[PDB]
Design a binder for this molecule. Structure first.
Ligand code: CLA
Ligand code: CLA
Ligand code: CLA
Ligand code: CLA
Ligand code: CLA
Ligand code: CLA
Ligand code: CLA
Ligand code: CLA
Ligand SMILES: CC1=C(/C=C/C(C)=C/C=C/C(C)=C/C=C/C=C(C)/C=C/C=C(C)/C=C/C2=C(C)CCCC2(C)C)C(C)(C)CCC1
Ligand SMILES: CC1=C(/C=C/C(C)=C/C=C/C(C)=C\C=C/C=C(C)/C=C/C=C(C)/C=C/C2=C(C)CCCC2(C)C)C(C)(C)CCC1
Ligand SMILES: CC1=C(/C=C/C(C)=C/C=C/C(C)=C\C=C\C=C(C)\C=C\C=C(C)\C=C\C2=C(C)CCCC2(C)C)C(C)(C)CCC1
Lengths: 154, 193, 30, 42, 733, 97, 80, 66
């Protein structure tokens, strides 16, 4: 497929890895009575392994000759779940955090002792401000247009 | 005004030919550059006004389109055909040396004159019919040339972009393809494959 | 044969002479 | 009481509470949605 | 003056041992010497240049002499792939018998060192065949060294010493350097290729005696002047060709084939002759650009004055830069070192991928050694380039004469520059380290399938663009309908596409996620080293912590413990800090190269591909695994030829660690200690009969930074060199 | 195909252009750009003994001022174009359309 | 010997002199500030270069400057 | 007549070697005695690297800003 890779659903090496992992955990499982709690734990790890490989196979991940997923970050629309979509989620959260922290710093900057609220958090003010991050992209875009985002002549 | 509701630039009062107040990048902020731009704009407008029919008319006839009419020079023994006639000098180095000397001389003659108003509208030998008679009608003809030439430039852009969107086409071949089924033959298919 | 002459020449005699000479130049007083 | 809430608002304590909540959250998310190299919902 | 150093009265009057040390470390900083003038400055530099050239000629002459007198050259020419070349003989009276035995190799009569510089392949490729040829070379170079000393001596006497106005005639020097130094030299080299090297490649031994009888081409000279040059490209060598023989030999002297010689795995000699001829023409025609004595050409000053964009986004543009650069030797040295460092890395990257010497690509220890060599040289050269940018800003920069031009605007928005270099370095660092650590945790917990392995799809797409088929992207040169493929099918593309898709060579090696990660580490190192050096240069004239820094010079200890503490606030200190990051960066580069190749040469490319995505893989499957033969170079059970590399390996480990002392311990500790020692000496009978002429003191603050950086670097280089050469040569593959 | 023909044509045309076409442009540009100068003054006035330009060779009884240096420059161009067309004609190179 | 200079930004608070451990600096009369005194460095041959004076100056930027220069027995603080 | 800016006025520091260069501060008192070379006393919101928050400046080193 892309970059000479093959889908992990079609990869012999991928299935060989799932097989060798499961047989490894079963080799550990042969040591304990099947009713015992170590046994149930190793069974849970086995079920979680099958869930892992089956999900990677389902969601269309490409594999290398190593039998391991490789991520396509070029922007190819078949693989936005591998970077572009979690990336937009990240930028939303990071923009949220930074926008909220900036809101707090602006809110306390004209206090009589600003540093006082930087080492002892004004939690009521913080709670008032945390949900501004929900609309941070509109707020920051509007500030960029209005000229409130950047300090003048710095 | 090109865009109703928008404040015209400070340096565009509307007096110039074809001045509708369009310079959103303020590229004419410096006056010297603006004058140079009026000259160069007229040069492009006139090259385009000559080149558009030279592209279309041989296509309406049996001759190839504007792209095919350049193709003999790619192959080594190439000889041109003007109206189906294998013109003898049609080899690429011949007409290439010819074109370099002739074009270089003429255009460089334009480089060595600085009126600067003659660099836009020289006239004289280039106005033998004397359409510069009535300065009102001559200025209206300036608006005439500028709008005609801008139109020709836009058309040329359409020809090149259509040529990229349909390699080995003709503007009139594209037009006929559209006239067949206008609702299913559109730029929409090129914008949306 | 020649290395048996020049290896001690540049590895023993030359460093001794250069170090002694540079020592003298460096400790001189005009 | 007021002084104690003040102490609990101080930088290290607010940090332990905040990151402890964040850790419990991320742990539980990886508990119900383990592994996951991708955003599968598209 | 009155004693050493005679160029510094302030140092000669020092009663401490410092006087000696600083006399050595300041001997070449002419601008700081007593009674210095501009004329003396330029003249001392010029003579020093002749002295350097003499050193270089004498050094190459020595290499020639030793290969001819103690080496394998004649035997090596007959069997390039089964004779280990000999650098020189070993006469060490400290050898036991086992060392005499184990180092006696390469078919020699006593202990010898195997050369890993690759001079055998080079001299063989250019036409040298006999030890006699090598002796003629060595005597010729000894001669050239002597005439270098002669000219350097000559231009120090009056009427032979040039005026500074002559040194500042930039247009003339550029015309002669481009047209003559670059162009004519290249043209002559094409001459040597077609008259000597290509004949020697076809079995003809052409020397000074017979080179007038022999024709380089059967029709030669006449198709050149007619303008039908293709007769020179007519009959190339056959794809079945033996390099020292007339089998498969053609008659062509100038080709554009594009690949490698199938036997030697190196570039075609006719290709190289054609290359030097063509670029020689470009340099000749380009060396007529600037104005001298004939009323035609450019005023570089006028061109610089002319390049000022309207709208003023660059202010006054490049106005005043001609004097700013021509009057500042540090600006010139900075540009020279920057460019020279770039093309040094370029040489490193192109000599492993496109080998130009016969039978050098099969010598793996040599290819590794040369790549490492030139990458470390390139690094040091880059750090120096920035160092002299800073020194320029302090000593030569005239703010009023560069007012509002591009150069001053660098200083004017230095915080945006420095802050964004900081951002890029932090992003690269956070995420490259984060992905490596994630992958290491996945492999620790036994779930390699959970790694984050990002395909280097952009570089892969570029390799496809070059015609590599490994990734199936079907773009230009990788696609049949591409105009770029059609345009070159008749020329270089058959040989090129043949070479790039051969799996044995290093031409655009196949890349995967492990290459992605290390490439981002390399980006991190370039950005951080660049951040340190750029901040150092732009803050050299001052900061908010030290606004008057320009008044204190390039190198000073600090500004005391006031204002918060000011250690390592000088620009020199920024260089000193950046050298560590350069050693780190080139360490990553060379680790990368050597591991990828050592796995390629073993047919075990997969080991790199799978193990390079987590850092334990690098620690265990590269360093630990390949130290095996090295660390056994000597042991309780005996020795072998690798012992010199085992010893050296520890030597570096020692020197490096010694450096840590000077870097962690600072001065006052040692000064008080030395005071107790002075007391001890004066109060010890018999010994107090002996008195020191120079008061023993602890090394200076800056001096300790330098000494410790030097130990750190010597240990760094010697350690990695021992491991590189022992791990490759021990396997030779 | 004939070297004397192509070289003579190209060099004659180059000398011709430089003489009757591009001469004024050449001179006004070499005049406004002027002699190279260090620290606000020419290299020779600054003290470079060998930076004095040669006014003897630049004198020509050619009415417009065309001299030996002009001949050398334009003739060089004509020979470079000439050997370009010669070498490029004997190629046999043809791109695949 | 190290060079030491005073700049007319000096406000005459005397702290550089009080800080100096070798007595390099003095207070001399002057008319440029309210304290009517300015510092001076008449004994820089005894200056050891510790910059305690600079640590003591309240002026922004400093009004004492120590330019470490040619080393002597006195400037290296040697008792031997 | 009073020399220098009004007390309490915000001024922009023009002294390039000042920690507060191109920043602003509040005027405290302007010493009207001539021969005083740096009569303007400015207090600042942030301490400099010497933990000092006030400094004297010349008349041409302060620019009154509202
Ligand atoms: C400049 C490059 C160079 C280098 C790095 C070496 C390195 C070496 N040489 Mg060689 N040598 C050289 C040039 C060089 N040589 C030249 C040009 C000649 C004359 C043809 C010789 C002739 C020579 C002989 C006969 C012998 C060596 C030997 C050796 C080895 C032991 C060192 C020694 O005996 O002192 C070197 C002895 C010399 C005579 C060298 C001086 C030759 C010229 C004039 C160098 C200029 C020296 C100058 C006064 C100081 C300049 C400092 C430096 C830049 C050179 C050593 C590995 C010995 C050996 O092989 O041991 C196994 C040995 O017997 N050398
Ligand atoms: C392994 C050794 C090491 C490491 C990790 C670093 C790390 C760094 N150096 Mg440094 N450096 C080193 C050696 C090292 N250096 C040496 C030997 C020298 C010579 C003295 C220098 C001299 C030097 C200079 C002069 C500069 C740097 C710079 C930097 C930063 C570069 C930007 C970056 O990569 O983003 C961040 C990268 C990291 C690797 C940070 C790692 C830590 C992460 C964030 C862990 C996260 C915390 C985690 C939750 C655990 C919490 C622990 C808990 C107890 C709180 C970075 C923090 C440059 C800089 O400041 O960049 C702006 C800079 O100018 N270095
Ligand atoms: C309000 C918090 C905040 C904001 C909005 C920014 C914003 C910015 N920082 Mg900064 N920074 C911060 C905190 C913040 N920083 C802290 C706490 C530190 C010390 C650890 C730094 C250290 C730092 C460095 C070294 C650099 C930046 C840089 C930058 C710029 C580039 C983005 C970046 O590299 O992020 C990187 C972010 C970090 C390295 C750490 C951020 C710490 C957390 C995630 C944010 C703080 C949260 C805060 C506690 C919120 C309080 C909640 C409140 C409502 C009560 C950007 C304008 C770079 C720059 O100059 O760009 C040109 C750069 O070089 N920052
Ligand atoms: C839709 C309304 C509209 C109106 C009010 C006008 C009106 C006018 N046009 Mg325009 N024109 C239009 C549409 C319009 N045009 C469109 C859609 C195009 C695109 C092809 C053009 C392109 C065009 C050109 C090329 C020219 C004019 C010119 C003119 C003027 C000359 C009329 C004349 O005969 O000489 C009195 C006139 C005031 C001429 C002119 O210069 O104006 C003086 C001229 O050369 N027009
Ligand atoms: C920048 C470096 C980096 C990055 C990009 C990642 C990325 C990832 N890691 Mg790794 N990791 C790292 C460093 C990094 N890690 C380091 C330094 C360590 C050592 C401490 C680890 C140790 C580690 C382990 C042990 C594991 C991971 C796992 C994961 C994956 C978890 C995804 C997830 O939580 O589901 C999705 C989560 C969310 C969507 C949360 C966001 C939603 C917020 C909270 C609310 C949004 C409201 C709207 C993810 C792709 C896990 C995995 O399964 O890998 C596949 C896992 O097992 N990491
Ligand atoms: C064409 C290249 C070139 C040129 C001509 C110069 C020229 C100059 N440099 Mg520069 N520089 C360069 C490249 C260059 N440099 C490079 C590549 C670097 C990066 C390493 C630097 C970094 C640099 C700094 C930081 C400084 C200079 C300084 C100077 C000036 C004085 C040097 C001096 O007198 O000290 C004399 C030099 C020595 C006595 C050398 C002894 C120390 C060396 C490094 C130890 C050798 C290693 C060891 C012995 C190897 C043997 C190991 C053994 C086990 C085998 C001088 C004008 C200094 C200066 O004047 O600043 C204004 C200054 O501080 N340079
Ligand atoms: C055609 C006339 C001419 C020529 C041949 C030279 C030649 C030279 N000049 Mg000179 N110069 C000239 C005219 C000329 N100059 C004039 C007219 C002036 C007055 C305006 C000057 C004034 C001048 C000064 C002030 C100085 C020089 C210097 C130099 C030397 C530079 C050092 C060097 O070796 O680099 C050699 C360069 C090359 C070999 C070409 C570039 C190398 C490339 C970029 C890298 C390698 C290419 C290739 C891959 C190599 C393969 C490697 C393999 C073979 C191992 C050099 C030999 C400097 C010097 O060293 O003084 C002695 C110096 O200080 N020149
Ligand atoms: C600076 C490098 C250089 C030098 C010094 C020489 C020198 C020489 N060459 Mg050579 N040659 C060179 C480069 C060089 N060549 C290159 C790059 C090529 C590849 C095209 C050739 C290919 C070549 C061939 C095929 C032949 C020579 C021949 C000769 C000899 C006679 C040349 C002659 O009189 O022609 C005439 C000179 C002129 C008409 C004046 C030229 C005007 C100048 C260049 C300006 C002569 C000693 C001939 C010979 O006898 O072989 C030994 C011979 O047949 N050369
Ligand atoms: C500080 C300072 C300084 C210094 C600086 C430096 C040191 C710099 C550097 C730098 C560098 C180090 C740079 C680099 C660069 C590069 C570039 C700029 C590139 C180019 C490119 C291109 C454009 C290419 C292209 C191409 C081709 C041609 C073909 C193939 C493909 C490609 C695309 C690749 C000075 C002295 C000056 C002054 C003072 C200050
Ligand atoms: C008297 C007279 C006349 C005449 C004139 C004439 C006849 C002229 C001549 C002139 C000429 C006729 C000139 C020429 C030429 C020049 C030059 C200067 C040259 C050159 C060449 C070159 C430079 C080359 C190069 C090369 C080489 C060598 C190698 C490779 C190839 C090439 C090309 C690169 C007339 C009547 C008109 C007018 C009156 C007067
Ligand atoms: C698409 C894509 C891609 C690409 C990318 C790129 C190439 C980009 C660019 C980008 C860029 C080139 C950007 C820029 C920037 C600039 C600036 C100028 C900035 C800024 C920022 C700011 C201003 C911020 C602010 C804030 C906020 C908003 C929130 C938080 C707080 C703060 C304040 C921080 C790749 C292939 C990779 C992957 C796939 C997808």
């Amino acid at each position: 497929d892309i970059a000479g890779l093959t889908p992990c659903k079609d990869s012999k090496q991928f299935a060989k890895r799932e097989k060798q992992s499961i047989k490894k955990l079963e080799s550990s499982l042969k040591l304990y009575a099947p009713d015992s709690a170590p046994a149930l734990a190793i069974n849970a790890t086995i079920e979680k392994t099958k869930r892992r490989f089956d999900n990677y196979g389902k969601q269309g991940l490409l594999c290398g000759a190593d039998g391991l997923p490789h991520l396509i970050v070029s922007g190819d629309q078949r693989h936005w779940g591998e970077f572009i979509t979690p990336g937009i989620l990240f930028l939303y959260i990071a923009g949220w955090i930074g926008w909220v922290g900036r809101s707090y710093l602006i809110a306390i900057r004209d206090d009589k002792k600003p540093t006082q609220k930087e080492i002892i958090i004004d939690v009521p003010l913080a709670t008032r401000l945390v949900f501004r991050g929900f609309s941070w992209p509109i707020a920051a875009y509007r500030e960029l247009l209005n000229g409130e985002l950047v300090a003048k002549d710095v | 005004d090109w865009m109703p509701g928008q404040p015209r630039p400070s340096y565009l009062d509307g007096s110039a030919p074809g001045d509708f107040g369009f310079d959103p990048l303020r590229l004419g902020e410096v006056p010297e550059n603006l004058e140079r731009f009026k000259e160069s704009e007229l040069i492009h407008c006139r090259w385009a006004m000559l080149a558009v029919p030279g592209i279309l008319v041989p296509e309406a006839l049996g001759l190839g389109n504007w792209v095919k009419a350049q193709e003999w020079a790619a192959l080594p023994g190439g000889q041109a055909t003007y109206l189906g006639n294998p013109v003898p000098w049609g080899t690429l180095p011949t007409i290439l040396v010819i074109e370099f000397l002739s074009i270089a001389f003429v255009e460089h003659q334009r480089s060595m004159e600085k009126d600067p108003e003659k660099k836009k509208y020289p006239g004289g030998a280039f106005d033998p019919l004397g359409y510069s008679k009535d300065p009102k009608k001559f200025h209206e003809y300036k608006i005439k040339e500028v709008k005609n030439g801008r139109l020709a430039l836009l058309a040329f852009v359409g020809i090149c972009v259509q040529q990229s969107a349909y390699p080995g086409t003709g503007p009139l071949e594209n037009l006929a393809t559209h006239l067949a089924d206008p609702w299913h033959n559109t730029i929409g298919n090129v914008l949306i494959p | 044969n020649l290395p048996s002459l020049f290896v001690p020449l540049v590895g023993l005699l030359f460093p001794a002479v250069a170090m002694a000479s540079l020592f003298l130049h460096v400790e001189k007083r005009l | 009481m007021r002084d104690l809430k003040t102490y609990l608002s101080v930088a290290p304590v607010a940090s332990t509470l905040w990151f402890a909540a964040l850790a419990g959250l991320l742990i539980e998310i990886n508990r119900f949605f383990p592994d996951a190299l991708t955003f599968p919902f598209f | 003056a009155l004693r050493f150093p005679r160029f510094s009265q302030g140092l000669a009057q020092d009663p401490t041992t410092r006087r000696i040390w600083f006399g050595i470390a300041t001997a070449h900083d002419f601008e700081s010497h007593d009674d210095i003038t501009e004329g003396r400055l330029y003249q001392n530099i010029f003579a020093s240049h002749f002295g350097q050239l003499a050193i270089i000629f004498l050094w190459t002459s020595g290499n020639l002499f030793h290969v001819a007198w103690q080496g394998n050259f004649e035997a090596w020419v007959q069997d390039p792939l089964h004779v280990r070349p000999i650098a020189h003989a070993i006469w060490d009276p400290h050898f036991g018998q086992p060392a005499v035995e184990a180092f006696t190799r390469g078919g020699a009569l006593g202990p010898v060192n195997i050369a890993y510089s690759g001079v055998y392949q080079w001299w063989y490729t250019i036409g040298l065949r006999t030890n006699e040829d090598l002796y003629t070379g060595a005597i010729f170079l000894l001669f050239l060294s002597f005439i270098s000393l002669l000219a350097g001596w000559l231009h120090l006497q009056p009427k032979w010493k040039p005026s500074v106005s002559w040194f500042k005639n930039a247009e003339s020097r550029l015309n002669h350097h481009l047209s003559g130094l670059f162009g004519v030299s290249s043209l002559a080299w094409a001459g040597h290729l077609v008259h000597v090297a290509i004949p020697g490649s076809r079995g003809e031994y052409v020397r000074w005696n017979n080179f007038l009888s022999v024709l380089p081409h059967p029709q030669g000279l006449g198709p050149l002047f007619t303008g039908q040059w293709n007769l020179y490209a007519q009959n190339p060598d056959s794809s079945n060709h033996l390099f020292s023989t007339s089998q498969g030999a053609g008659t062509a002297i100038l080709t554009l084939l594009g690949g490698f010689h199938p036997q030697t795995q190196s570039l075609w000699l006719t290709d190289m002759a054609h290359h030097h001829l063509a670029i020689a023409i470009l340099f000749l025609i380009g060396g007529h650009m600037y104005r001298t004595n004939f009323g035609i050409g450019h005023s570089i000053k006028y061109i610089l004055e002319a390049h000022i964009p309207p709208g003023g986004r660059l202010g006054r543009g490049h106005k005043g830069l001609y004097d700013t650069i021509n009057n500042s030797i540090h600006f010139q040295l900075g540009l020279a070192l920057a460019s020279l460092g770039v093309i040094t890395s370029l040489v490193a990257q192109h000599m492993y991928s496109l080998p130009a010497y016969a039978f050098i690509a099969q010598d793996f220890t040599t290819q590794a050694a040369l790549y490492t060599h030139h990458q470390y040289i390139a690094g040091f050269i880059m750090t120096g380039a920035f160092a002299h940018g800073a020194i320029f800003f302090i000593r030569d920069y005239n703010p009023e004469q560069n007012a509002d031009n591009v150069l001053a605007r660098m200083l004017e928005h230095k915080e945006a520059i420095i802050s964004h270099l900081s951002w890029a370095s932090l992003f690269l660092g956070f995420h490259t380290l984060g992905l490596y650590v994630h992958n290491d945790v996945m492999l620790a917990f036994g779930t390699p399938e959970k790694q984050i392995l990002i395909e280097p799809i952009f570089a892969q797409w570029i390799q496809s663009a070059h015609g590599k088929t490994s990734y199936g992207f079907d773009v230009l040169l990788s696609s049949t309908n591409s105009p770029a493929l059609n345009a070159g099918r008749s020329i270089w593309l058959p040989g090129w596409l043949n070479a790039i898709n051969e799996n044995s060579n290093s031409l655009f090696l196949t890349i995967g996620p492990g290459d992605f990660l290390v490439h981002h580490a390399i980006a991190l190192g370039l950005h951080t080293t660049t951040l340190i050096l750029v901040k150092g240069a732009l803050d050299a004239r001052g900061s908010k912590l030290m606004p008057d820094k320009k008044d204190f010079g390039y190198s000073f200890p600090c500004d005391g413990p006031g204002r918060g503490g000011t250690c390592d606030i000088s620009a020199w200190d920024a260089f000193y800090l950046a050298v560590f990051w350069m050693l780190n960066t080139i360490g990553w580069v060379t680790f990368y190269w050597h591991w990828k190749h050592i796995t390629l040469w073993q047919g075990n490319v997969s080991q790199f591909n799978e193990s390079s995505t987590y850092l334990m893989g690098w620690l265990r499957d590269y360093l630990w695994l390949n130290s095996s033969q090295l660390i056994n170079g000597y042991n309780p059970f005996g020795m072998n030829s690798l012992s010199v590399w085992a010893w050296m390996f520890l030597f570096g480990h020692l020197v490096w660690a010694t450096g840590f002392m000077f870097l962690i311990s600072w001065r006052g500790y040692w000064q008080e200690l030395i005071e107790t020692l002075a007391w001890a000496h004066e109060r010890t009978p018999l010994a107090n009969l002996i008195r020191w002429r120079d008061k023993p003191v602890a090394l200076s603050i800056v001096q300790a930074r330098l000494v410790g950086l030097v130990h750190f670097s010597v240990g760094y280089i010697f350690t990695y060199a021992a491991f590189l050469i022992a791990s490759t040569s021990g396997k030779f593959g | 195909l004939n070297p004397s023909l192509v070289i003579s044509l190209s060099t004659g045309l180059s000398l011709f252009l430089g003489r009757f076409v591009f001469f004024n442009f050449q001179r006004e540009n070499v005049a406004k750009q002027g002699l190279p100068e260090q620290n606000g003054v020419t290299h020779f006035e600054a003290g470079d003994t060998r930076a004095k330009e040669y006014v003897s060779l630049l004198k020509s009884n050619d009415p417009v001022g065309f001299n030996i240096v002009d001949v050398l420059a334009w003739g060089s161009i004509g020979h470079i174009v000439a050997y370009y067309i010669l070498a490029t004609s004997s190629n046999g190179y043809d791109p695949k359309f | 010997s190290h060079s030491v200079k005073i700049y007319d930004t000096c406000i005459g608070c005397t702290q550089c002199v009080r800080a100096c451990p070798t007595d390099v600096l003095e207070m001399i009369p002057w008319g440029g500030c309210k304290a009517k005194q300015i510092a001076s460095a008449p004994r820089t041959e005894d200056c050891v270069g510790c910059k305690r004076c600079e640590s003591a100056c309240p002026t922004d930027f400093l009004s004492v400057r120590v330019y470490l220069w040619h080393e002597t027995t006195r400037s290296m603080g040697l008792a031997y | 007549p009073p020399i220098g800016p009004k007390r309490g006025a915000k001024v922009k520091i023009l002294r390039q070697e000042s920690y507060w260069y191109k920043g602003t501060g509040s005027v405290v008192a302007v010493d009207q005695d001539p021969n005083t070379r740096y009569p303007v006393v400015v207090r600042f919101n942030k301490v400099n690297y010497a933990n000092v928050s006030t400094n004297n400046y010349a008349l041409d080193e302060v620019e009154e800003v509202k």
